[PDB]
Design a protein around this ligand. Structure first.
Ligand SMILES: Cc1cc2nc3c(=O)[nH]c(=O)nc-3n(C[C@H](O)[C@H](O)[C@H](O)COP(=O)(O)OP(=O)(O)OC[C@H]3O[C@@H](n4cnc5c(N)ncnc54)[C@H](O)[C@@H]3O)c2cc1C
Ligand SMILES: *N(O)c1cc(C(F)(F)F)cc2c(=O)nc(N3CCN(CC4CCCCC4)CC3)sc12
Length: 428
């Protein structure tokens, strides 16, 4: 059960702060470290940390305590009939995926890396390319055990009398206490494969029409790479990949007797002319391609969603980005579906995009301009990717914030739980 003053950052490796980190596999010692912060209560307080994949400052606490939950990584049970897994909060999604597959069960929401803990997937209420059909990760949690500031472990359910604290802890960025353990309901599957259709669009307008014509209703998973650099009309052209979990009949014969296996890793004169355009189109257009899951897996990361109805507003912000002087090559676009009841949950239905800007003069100020425009158009930023926006902005993007903050003040009156993000965004 060691303790180390550590200089910590998020994945973005910005805004370092030093904390004492507790790393221990012993649950009892975590309860005690908490009571310990509470008795002197509460100085700089404490926050859980999972694997450190959020890009900003939610899993750091400058001059306070950070409890590394990764050692608490026990899988208690998996059951193919009830579809439930019961696991410690430090278990990660890659470990869970691998452990659940032989039961014909699939992690119901996967983000773009599986090096995330169950505790961080709940705390950021993460989403994946199936958001429009599955919701976000908080939708699939049937119970959790929350170590609260008074040292009790509350067992929370999404419809019990403890439903308000449950729903504050989904998306709550660890600020209601330390999730110790959870029960997640899994998606049944007969294979570890996808069958997928690709399409390429020529412009933002076409990208939007493809997402609005109803074709999305055929696919449980959908996302696209998106050009945010080309001037119009090329601006907003995309490479769209959509699909569903394959059934065993859909696998080729070769793959059929091991359907539930994860596989192991690991002309230029035409390129810019019309023959290159044709080739790119043909090559991103395909139907029913079978692919294993293992197939899929300095900079300011920026992600926002704009409500579905605000479509011209969304095209405007894309136009603003392209005209801005800041170039993002790696852009992921998708259309989110219905939101959940967590007050601080990020996903709303509408047009989500992740963009990644090279850090260079003028970007801070430009991104503050983006914040204003995302706000004014009904949208928000995602805490898992932020270490810069202001409290005023954040509070206006999230209109249920005061409701959440009153839940938090009930469960943690003395501020035992605190983080750099909590202080910057005035979530205490
Ligand atoms: C390459 C990359 C791709 C990504 N893609 C996506 C994506 O597609 N969709 C998406 O939604 N996100 C995505 N993310 C973000 C990532 O899913 C989230 O930031 C996830 O929360 C991080 O998990 P973690 O265990 O590392 O948590 P950490 O970053 O260590 O902590 C983040 C938050 O969770 C809290 N937390 C962690 N464990 C606990 C616990 N046991 N109890 C209470 N609170 C806890 C922390 O206090 C902090 O507020 C991506 C990140 C990377 C680096
Ligand atoms: N936005 O970042 C985003 C959104 C979504 C969606 F909303 F569609 F679910 C999915 C999503 C994702 O599945 N993966 C992402 N990343 C993993 C792959 N990336 C490429 C790497 C490799 C090169 C260098 C760093 C980036 C980007 C992040 S993001 C994402």
């Amino acid at each position: 059960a060691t303790t180390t003053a550590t200089r910590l950052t998020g994945w973005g490796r910005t805004a370092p702060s030093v904390a004492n980190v507790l790393r221990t596999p012993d649950a009892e010692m975590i309860v005690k470290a908490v009571a310990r912060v509470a008795e002197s209560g509460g100085g700089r307080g404490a926050i859980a940390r999972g694997l450190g994949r959020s890009y900003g400052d939610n899993a750091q606490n400058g001059g306070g305590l950070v409890i590394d939950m990764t050692p608490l990584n026990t899988i208690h049970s998996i059951d193919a009939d009830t579809k439930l897994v019961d696991i410690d909060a430090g278990v990660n999604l890659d470990q869970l995926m691998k452990a659940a597959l032989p039961f014909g069960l699939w992690v119901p929401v996967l983000p773009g890396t599986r090096q995330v803990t169950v505790g961080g997937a709940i705390a950021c209420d993460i989403h994946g390319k199936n958001h429009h059909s599955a919701g976000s990760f908080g939708n699939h949690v049937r119970s959790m055990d929350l170590l609260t500031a008074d040292g009790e472990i509350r067992h929370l359910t999404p419809t019990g009398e403890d439903a308000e604290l449950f729903w504050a802890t989904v998306g709550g960025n660890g600020l209601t206490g330390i999730i110790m353990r959870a029960t997640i309901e899994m998606t049944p599957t007969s294979t570890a494969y996808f069958i997928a259709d690709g399409d390429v669009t020529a412009s933002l307008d076409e990208t939007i029409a493809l997402h609005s014509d109803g074709s999305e209703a055929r696919y449980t998973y959908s996302s696209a790479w998106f050009d945010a650099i080309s001037a119009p009309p090329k601006l907003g052209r995309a490479a769209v990949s959509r699909g569903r979990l394959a059934t065993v009949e859909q696998l080729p014969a070769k793959l059929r007797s091991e359907p539930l296996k994860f596989d192991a890793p690991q002309a230029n004169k035409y390129t810019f002319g019309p023959i290159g355009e044709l080739w790119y189109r043909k090559s991103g257009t395909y139907r029913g391609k079978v692919q294993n899951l293992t197939q899929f897996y300095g900079f300011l990361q920026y992600q926002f969603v704009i409500p579905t109805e605000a479509v011209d507003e969304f095209k405007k912000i894309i136009g603003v980005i392209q005209a801005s002087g800041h170039y993002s090559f790696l852009n992921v676009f998708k259309l989110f579906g219905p939101r959940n009841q967590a007050p601080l949950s990020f996903p709303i239905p509408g047009w989500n995009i992740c963009v990644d800007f090279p850090i260079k003069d003028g970007l801070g100020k430009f991104v503050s301009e983006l914040d204003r425009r995302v706000l004014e158009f009904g949208g928000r930023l995602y805490t898992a990717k932020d270490s810069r926006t202001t409290a005023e902005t954040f509070h206006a993007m999230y209109p249920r914030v005061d409701e959440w903050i009153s839940v938090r003040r009930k469960v943690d009156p003395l501020r035992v739980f605190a983080s750099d993000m909590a202080r910057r965004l005035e979530l205490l």
